[PDB]
Scaffold this active site. Structure first.
Site, PDB file in Angstrom:
ATOM      1  CE1 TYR A  34     -34.451  -4.582  44.681  1.00  0.00           C
ATOM      2  CE2 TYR A  34     -32.119  -4.284  44.317  1.00  0.00           C
ATOM      3  CZ  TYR A  34     -33.333  -4.784  43.907  1.00  0.00           C
ATOM      4  OH  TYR A  34     -33.381  -5.496  42.723  1.00  0.00           O
ATOM      5  CE1 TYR A  35     -31.886  -7.843  45.225  1.00  0.00           C
ATOM      6  CE2 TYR A  35     -29.783  -6.793  44.730  1.00  0.00           C
ATOM      7  CZ  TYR A  35     -30.898  -7.497  44.325  1.00  0.00           C
ATOM      8  OH  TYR A  35     -31.047  -7.856  43.006  1.00  0.00           O
TER       9      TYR A  35
ATOM     10  CG  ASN B  72     -38.395   0.007  40.332  1.00  0.00           C
ATOM     11  OD1 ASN B  72     -38.148   0.389  41.474  1.00  0.00           O
ATOM     12  ND2 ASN B  72     -37.418  -0.162  39.460  1.00  0.00           N
TER      13      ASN B  72
ATOM     14  CB  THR C  76     -28.642  -2.715  29.190  1.00  0.00           C
ATOM     15  OG1 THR C  76     -28.254  -2.578  30.553  1.00  0.00           O
ATOM     16  CG2 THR C  76     -27.696  -3.747  28.557  1.00  0.00           C
TER      17      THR C  76
ATOM     18  CE  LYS D  33      -5.908  -7.263  11.083  1.00  0.00           C
ATOM     19  NZ  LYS D  33      -5.495  -8.612  11.571  1.00  0.00           N
TER      20      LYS D  33
ATOM     21  CD  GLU E 269       0.496 -14.435   5.261  1.00  0.00           C
ATOM     22  OE1 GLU E 269      -0.719 -14.210   5.453  1.00  0.00           O
ATOM     23  OE2 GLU E 269       1.351 -13.523   5.218  1.00  0.00           O
ATOM     24  NE  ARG E 270       5.412 -20.348   3.723  1.00  0.00           N
ATOM     25  CZ  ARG E 270       5.897 -20.728   2.547  1.00  0.00           C
ATOM     26  NH1 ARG E 270       7.179 -20.547   2.256  1.00  0.00           N
ATOM     27  NH2 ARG E 270       5.096 -21.294   1.653  1.00  0.00           N
ATOM     28  CB  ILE E 271       3.886 -18.359  12.057  1.00  0.00           C
ATOM     29  CG1 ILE E 271       3.001 -17.958  13.237  1.00  0.00           C
ATOM     30  CG2 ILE E 271       5.352 -18.421  12.456  1.00  0.00           C
ATOM     31  CD1 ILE E 271       3.342 -16.681  13.959  1.00  0.00           C
TER      32      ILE E 271
ATOM     33  CD  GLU F 152     -22.556  -6.339  38.154  1.00  0.00           C
ATOM     34  OE1 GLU F 152     -23.051  -6.993  39.147  1.00  0.00           O
ATOM     35  OE2 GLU F 152     -21.342  -5.907  38.203  1.00  0.00           O
ATOM     36  CB  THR F 153     -24.873  -4.116  32.659  1.00  0.00           C
ATOM     37  OG1 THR F 153     -25.320  -5.259  33.403  1.00  0.00           O
ATOM     38  CG2 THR F 153     -24.620  -4.557  31.237  1.00  0.00           C
TER      39      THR F 153
ATOM     40  CG  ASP G 286       9.443 -10.202  13.749  1.00  0.00           C
ATOM     41  OD1 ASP G 286      10.120  -9.857  14.742  1.00  0.00           O
ATOM     42  OD2 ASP G 286       9.800 -11.094  12.954  1.00  0.00           O
TER      43      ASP G 286
ATOM     44  CB  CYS H 157     -34.321  -2.153  41.510  1.00  0.00           C
ATOM     45  SG  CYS H 157     -34.075  -3.340  40.148  1.00  0.00           S
TER      46      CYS H 157
ATOM     47  CB  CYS I 164     -39.086   0.901  35.053  1.00  0.00           C
ATOM     48  SG  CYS I 164     -37.393   1.432  34.682  1.00  0.00           S
TER      49      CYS I 164
HETATM   50  N1  LIG Z   1     -30.686  -3.202  31.984  1.00  0.00           N
HETATM   51  C1  LIG Z   1     -31.810  -3.731  32.466  1.00  0.00           C
HETATM   52  N2  LIG Z   1     -32.604  -2.994  33.257  1.00  0.00           N
HETATM   53  C2  LIG Z   1     -33.712  -3.687  33.663  1.00  0.00           C
HETATM   54  C3  LIG Z   1     -34.063  -4.988  33.353  1.00  0.00           C
HETATM   55  N3  LIG Z   1     -35.271  -5.334  33.962  1.00  0.00           N
HETATM   56  C4  LIG Z   1     -35.590  -4.257  34.596  1.00  0.00           C
HETATM   57  N4  LIG Z   1     -34.719  -3.215  34.478  1.00  0.00           N
HETATM   58  C5  LIG Z   1     -34.771  -1.861  35.056  1.00  0.00           C
HETATM   59  O1  LIG Z   1     -33.444  -1.346  35.062  1.00  0.00           O
HETATM   60  C6  LIG Z   1     -33.066  -0.880  36.349  1.00  0.00           C
HETATM   61  C7  LIG Z   1     -31.646  -1.389  36.619  1.00  0.00           C
HETATM   62  O2  LIG Z   1     -30.689  -0.340  36.416  1.00  0.00           O
HETATM   63  P1  LIG Z   1     -29.914  -0.185  35.000  1.00  0.00           P
HETATM   64  O3  LIG Z   1     -29.057   1.035  35.065  1.00  0.00           O
HETATM   65  O4  LIG Z   1     -30.868  -0.334  33.906  1.00  0.00           O
HETATM   66  O5  LIG Z   1     -28.987  -1.496  35.127  1.00  0.00           O
HETATM   67  P2  LIG Z   1     -27.768  -1.965  34.183  1.00  0.00           P
HETATM   68  O6  LIG Z   1     -27.731  -1.039  33.045  1.00  0.00           O
HETATM   69  O7  LIG Z   1     -28.281  -3.347  33.693  1.00  0.00           O
HETATM   70  O8  LIG Z   1     -26.559  -2.186  34.969  1.00  0.00           O
HETATM   71  C8  LIG Z   1     -34.119  -1.414  37.315  1.00  0.00           C
HETATM   72  O9  LIG Z   1     -34.473  -0.367  38.190  1.00  0.00           O
HETATM   73  C9  LIG Z   1     -35.312  -1.859  36.462  1.00  0.00           C
HETATM   74  O10 LIG Z   1     -36.514  -1.060  36.587  1.00  0.00           O
HETATM   75  C10 LIG Z   1     -33.207  -5.767  32.507  1.00  0.00           C
HETATM   76  O11 LIG Z   1     -33.353  -6.929  32.127  1.00  0.00           O
HETATM   77  N5  LIG Z   1     -32.083  -5.038  32.105  1.00  0.00           N
END
Ligand SMILES: Nc1nc2c(ncn2[C@@H]2O[C@H](COP(=O)(O)OP(=O)(O)O)[C@@H](O)[C@H]2O)c(=O)[nH]1
Ligand SMILES: Cc1cn([C@H]2C[C@H](O)[C@@H](COP(=O)(O)OP(=O)(O)OP(=O)(O)O)O2)c(=O)[nH]c1=O
Lengths: 733, 16
Positions: free
Chosen positions: A726-727, A433, A205, A87, A11-13, A619-620, A16, A435, A221
């Site tokens: 932790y860390y 656990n 997640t 889409k 098709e043509r670009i 994180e996610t 707009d 973390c 966990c």
């Molecule tokens: N989402 C996720 N959680 C995990 C994983 N392995 C272990 N966990 C558990 O998930 C926790 C991390 O917090 P969560 O809110 O699930 O992290 P996020 O959702 O990945 O940002 C840890 O305390 C673990 O016991 C993994 O691969 N993914």
């Protein structure tokens, strides 16, 4: 300029049309230049360019302008992305009707078939009226990348995306409250959907990508305790292999394994040590990993007085002979008051093998008086094999290793049992656990299918503190969060008998927070000067109060958890009765909720769930709601992440108006402020918190962190009742 | 980088 389509037709670009979409996406955003985006993307067009490629080009164009100075590009890119995904799944911008969508997905084997059995077509019609697809326009670029990357149902081989955010949210809700009475079922579905679609409640997640699909594996966990026996060592190992194949983080207590040199069977054998077994656990953990490094994580706990503690402490040290190193597992050292006192007085610490000191190990978690009694007894008993080390040496060896690797964690066992939801005589807490935020009771197995063992599991989620106007919004939110996660415990599968035992017995949950930093920012408070202590106390009282209310309401409706009698809650004891008294000196905020009414109601009707709260990293989940992670201060205003499509940038929430309000991670002068806030939070939390410690070399003479400072902060944490650590982050500058 | 220098006389006063 010729354009090629999906069927491969020319098709043509139409420049707009492109502009219209850009205009659309920009609606309501500030400081975004549509022309700037058009200039950058038009120059890469060429004769016969596929339509999909035009979409990617403009998306990236927008994405590359994300910055502190123009954070609304995050949304410009996002909306463009959303448009393209619409889409891509539905063949148009407008999503299909919920019912049609679900029918199609069930037929393709992408959605569970129970959805169609559990709800009628009229009920799906009703649900469709709840959905607001314009909520897709509120995500940030980063967030859409996560959604597309690991949440939305899709064909991983062909790259086809089958759904959009709002169907994900509505169906998660649908599934979790599917077994509710018809009179209240849809009321709950709508309320939960609003909660999560308007970012008030964050879900893990696993739930976010699975609930609604045919799978039933949602455990993240698992806490495993290992006995001092080849049968138990095999059981533990078998359990880890099953669980790491399914993506669960593992917490392993291997403190009972007898020391190297110890006798086996009498004098016919002499133990090989724990190292060998630790290495066996590591391979179990990494058994379902690409190559043998990726994914499958675990944290292994052990007492500080174990006879092999000096060899255990340097297991992740990156300098040593391969036969004495177990580098791909993090470790959690377990300490109690006695150990700290030896340090302060400059005395020695006596090391023993668990097998040679009857009653000591158990006493360590459940009775500090008894531990001291036994410990001093056995120090003088000459028949017991022991070793003496200078407390300063052991603490520094441990802290040196924690400093250099960042992954040598601490667990204050006394605090975990004197201030907890469990009665230490019946169900002590002996480990954490991966973390370091979960703290649940466990029992060793003698076989994979041993039904008398207990493997702790925990279901998580979190409240977005940046999405609530006032703290009384948490009443509705706690109801929805507890009810949905309790339903999940009956929905998911349990591969090992012992893990089902703990989940059905105690029904333990772990709900925490995200966006704390933003929250403090908009209330004009910081982390380091003590200015947020009372607000934090007020905030965490609300959270714990409403969570116990929710769980308590649920028990009335559906019965308390089987093993509710093993909790301190069962005896009328509350978080506010056992907290570390030192806390009183650093916070003066009063309790605002009726805890005494609640005390009675718990005693009478019990709790559905033995534990409700636990502060975990994230994180996610935070990325999806453009929120600061868990309770940590941002490292900077803009986050940079790598992707296949390009560089992902995310600007902290409301940077425009709060840039000076934020307190970035390396801006804090020390750990005191933050450690006090963790202490205040631990007053009300059922489980534990993933506390970090942060040190910057350039703030110290000669760029070297003094051991004095590291030990001082350790003690401070203990003083304010911090259960775990932790860390340890050290700056790369 | 860490400076491994511990003053036990300074830590002794701390109250756990
Ligand atoms: N989402 C996720 N959680 C995990 C994983 N392995 C272990 N966990 C558990 O998930 C926790 C991390 O917090 P969560 O809110 O699930 O992290 P996020 O959702 O990945 O940002 C840890 O305390 C673990 O016991 C993994 O691969 N993914
Ligand atoms: C038999 C044997 C056990 N072990 C270790 C690992 C285990 O933690 C621990 C005990 O496992 P087991 O020896 O099977 O346990 P048990 O109840 O038979 O023990 P005991 O000898 O006291 O009667 O001993 C070795 O290291 N080498 C060996 O040859």
């Amino acid at each position: 300029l010729l354009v090629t389509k999906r069927d491969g037709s020319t098709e043509r670009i139409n420049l707009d049309k492109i502009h219209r979409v850009l205009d659309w996406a920009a609606e309501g955003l500030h400081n975004v230049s549509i022309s700037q985006v058009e200039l950058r993307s038009h120059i890469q067009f060429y004769d016969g360019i596929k339509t999909s490629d035009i979409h990617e080009t403009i998306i990236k164009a927008a994405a590359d302008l994300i910055s502190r100075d123009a954070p609304d590009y995050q949304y410009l890119a996002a909306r463009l992305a959303i448009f393209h995904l619409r889409k891509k799944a539905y063949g148009q911008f407008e999503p299909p009707a919920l019912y049609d969508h679900v029918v199609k997905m069930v037929e393709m084997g992408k959605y569970d078939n129970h959805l169609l059995e559990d709800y009628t077509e009229e009920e799906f019609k009703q649900m469709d009226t709840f959905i607001d697809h314009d909520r897709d326009m509120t995500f940030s670029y980063a967030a859409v990348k996560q959604l597309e990357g690991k949440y939305l149902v899709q064909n991983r081989v062909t790259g086809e995306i089958y759904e959009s955010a709002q169907f994900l949210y509505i169906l998660v809700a649908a599934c979790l409250f599917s077994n509710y009475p018809r009179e209240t079922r849809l009321q709950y579905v709508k309320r939960f959907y609003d909660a999560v679609s308007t970012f008030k409640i964050s879900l893990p997640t696993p739930i976010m990508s699975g609930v609604r699909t045919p799978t039933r594996q949602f455990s993240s966990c698992v806490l495993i305790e290992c006995g001092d026996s080849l049968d138990s060592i095999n059981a533990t190992s078998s359990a880890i292999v099953k669980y790491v194949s399914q993506r669960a983080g593992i917490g392993i207590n291997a403190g009972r394994i007898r020391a190297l040199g110890s006798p086996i069977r009498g004098g016919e054998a002499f133990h090989t040590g724990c190292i060998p077994f630790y290495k066996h656990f590591q391979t179990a953990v990494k058994s379902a990993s690409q190559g043998g490094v990726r994914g499958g994580a675990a944290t292994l706990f052990y007492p500080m007085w174990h006879l092999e503690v000096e060899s255990l402490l340097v297991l992740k040290n990156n300098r040593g002979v391969e036969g004495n190193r177990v580098r791909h597992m993090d470790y959690g050292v377990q300490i109690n008051k006695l150990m700290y006192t030896r340090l302060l007085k400059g005395e020695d610490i006596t090391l023993f093998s668990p097998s040679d000191v009857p009653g000591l190990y158990d006493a360590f978690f459940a009775d500090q008086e008894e531990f001291e009694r036994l410990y001093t007894k056995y120090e003088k008993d000459d028949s017991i094999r022991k070793q003496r080390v200078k407390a300063v040496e052991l603490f520094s060896l441990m802290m040196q290793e924690r400093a250099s690797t960042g992954r040598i964690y601490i667990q204050n066992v006394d605090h975990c049992n004197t201030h907890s939801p469990f009665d230490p005589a019946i169900a002590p807490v002996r480990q954490s656990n991966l973390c370091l935020e979960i703290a649940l009771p466990t029992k060793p197995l003698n076989d994979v299918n041993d039904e008398n063992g207990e493997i702790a599991l925990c279901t998580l989620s979190a409240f977005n503190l940046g999405a609530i106007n006032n703290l009384d919004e948490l009443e509705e939110l706690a109801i929805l969060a507890v009810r949905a996660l309790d339903a999940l415990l009956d929905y998911q599968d349990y591969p090992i008998p012992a893990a089902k035992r703990g989940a059905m017995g105690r029904r333990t949950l772990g709900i925490g927070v995200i966006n704390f930093a933003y929250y403090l920012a908009k209330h004009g408070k910081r982390y380091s000067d003590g200015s947020a202590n009372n607000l934090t106390h007020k905030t965490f009282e609300a959270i714990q109060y409403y969570l116990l209310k929710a769980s308590n309401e649920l028990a009335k409706e559906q019965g308390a958890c089987p093993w509710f009698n093993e909790t301190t809650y069962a005896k009328g004891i509350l978080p506010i009765d056992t907290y570390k008294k030192d806390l009183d000196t650093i916070a003066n905020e009063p309790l605002h909720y009726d805890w005494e009414a609640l005390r009675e109601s718990i005693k009478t009707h019990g709790l559905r769930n033995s534990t409700l709260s636990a502060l975990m990293p994230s994180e996610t989940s935070s990325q999806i709601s453009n929120a600061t992670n868990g309770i940590e201060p941002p490292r900077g205003y803009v986050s940079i992440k790598a992707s296949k499509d390009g560089i992902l940038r995310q600007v902290v929430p409301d940077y425009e108006h709060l840039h000076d309000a934020y307190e970035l991670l390396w801006e804090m002068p020390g750990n005191d402020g933050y450690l006090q806030l963790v202490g205040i939070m631990q007053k009300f939390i059922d489980q534990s918190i993933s506390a970090n410690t942060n040190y910057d070399p350039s703030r110290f003479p000669s760029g070297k962190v003094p051991m004095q400072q590291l030990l001082k902060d350790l003690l401070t944490a203990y003083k304010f009742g911090v259960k775990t650590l932790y860390y340890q982050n050290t700056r790369d500058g | 980088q860490i400076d491994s220098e511990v003053d036990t006389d300074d830590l002794s006063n701390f109250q756990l």
